[PDB]
Amino acid sequence: QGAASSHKLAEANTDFAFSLYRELAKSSPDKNIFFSPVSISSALAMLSLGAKGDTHTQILEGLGFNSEADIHQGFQHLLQTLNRPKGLQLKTANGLFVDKSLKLLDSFLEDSKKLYQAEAFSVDFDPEEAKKQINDWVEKQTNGKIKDLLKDLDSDTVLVLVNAIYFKGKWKKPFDPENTKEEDFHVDEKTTVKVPMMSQKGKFYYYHDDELSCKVLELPYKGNASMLIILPDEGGLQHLEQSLTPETLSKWLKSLTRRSVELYLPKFKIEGTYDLKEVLSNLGITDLFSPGADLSGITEEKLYVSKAVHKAVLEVNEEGTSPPEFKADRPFLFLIRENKTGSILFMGKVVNP
């Protein structure tokens, strides 16, 4: 239909981010969430290079696109824009591991390299030595921050998708460590957890959303990205999540004003690990992850995605470079977005810091 616009990309991806948050939140409640919805969108987009028929349809439509949409040069442009050196410098592992007895079409290897900067490997799939080789590659690609990604590996495995990312960003406005004090984080009515509370009093873009009974605060990162922290009022989190949509976000963006805030933010490390087959099953991307998948653009041989893992890790600390109180001493949501593109890089929920 002609390559889709950057604006189409920004809209399809952002609706995919939120819909994916909403499924994760419904699936595993009361657990820490952290994923990179743009990493996932890109990996599915990459795989769609080699998908045909309903397999191809289910991917695009699940990504937020018309069935006949042409998305590749748009994704290519978006990615090179995120990966600019004035960016976050996210080192990420994105690998495709396929049975070595299968001959891969050249058009796929070239097109996934150039467009998506994604690496494909033909591999012998002995359950043990293969998991070693793959986990070791992710380790290298992520500078050792993500070890042992794969837990186990079935002998009849034909195709493994691996998507891993570790993020530790630098604040535009850094907390002074001297202000950091142990405080109670109230996980729920009956659970308390002791946490280093970072504190800072300054000017931040802030909004108190009465409609949704939550506060919203923006923390700028070094590298033209920002964390939007959403703190619900007492006993409101679930309703806040139900009302968590692209239209709410933009409403929040127009509504933030630069205000003097007293800010209390815990230093924390969270993690998400996801099986893309069960996570995407409700988003309607099913055929791809089962024996009758049409991946005849990848190989003429019968083929499907046997295993697909996304893992994302986030460290938050103090480094480095009437008034309202924003005290995050109970579960809260956040997302990290790219300023230039509006891209939702990460989304998360801190329940157990």
Author numbering: -4 to 316, 330 to 361
Sentences from the paper on this structure:
Hypothesizing that a serpin reflecting a highly conserved sequence may offer insight into the delicate balance between folding and function, we designed conserpin (consensus serpin). To design conserpin we used the consensus approach and a previously reported MSA of 219 serpin sequences. Conserpin (396 aa) shares the highest similarity with α1-AT (137 residue differences; 62% sequence identity). Characterization of its function, structure and folding reveal a serpin that is inhibitory, folds reversibly, is thermostable and resistant to polymerisation.
The crystal structure of conserpin, confirms that it adopts the archetypal native serpin fold. Comparison of native and latent state conserpin structures with available native, latent and cleaved structures of α1-AT545556, plasminogen activator inhibitor 1 (PAI-1), α1-antichymotrypsin (ACH), neuroserpin, antithrombin and the thermostable serpins, thermopin63 and tengpin reveal that despite having the highest thermostability, native conserpin has the fewest H-bonds and salt bridges. Further, native state conserpin has the largest accessible surface area and largest solvent inaccessible cavity volume of all assessed serpins. The D-helix of conserpin is shortened by the deletion of five residues, four at the N-terminus (L84, E86, I87 and P88 in α1-AT) and one at the C-terminus (Q109 in α1-AT). The rigidity of hD in conserpin is probably due to a salt bridge between Q105R79 of hD and E376346 and interactions of the N-terminus with hD. Four residues of the extension were resolved in the crystal structure and a single H-bond is observed between the backbone of residue A-1conserpin and the N-terminus of hD (D65conserpin). The breach region, consisting of a highly conserved electrostatic network between residues E342α1-AT, K290α1-AT and D341α1-AT at the top of the A-sheet is important for controlling the conformational change that drives protease inhibition. This network is significantly extended in conserpin, compared to α1-AT. Specifically, the mutations of T339E310 and S292K264 contribute to a salt bridge network spanning s3A, s5A and s6A with K191163. Conserpin contains three mutations in this region; Y187A159 and G115A88, which allow s2A to more tightly pack against hF, and Y160W132, which further improves the packing density. Although native conserpin features fewer overall number of polar contacts compared to other metastable serpins, new, specific interactions stabilise a rigidified native state that is less frustrated than α1-AT.
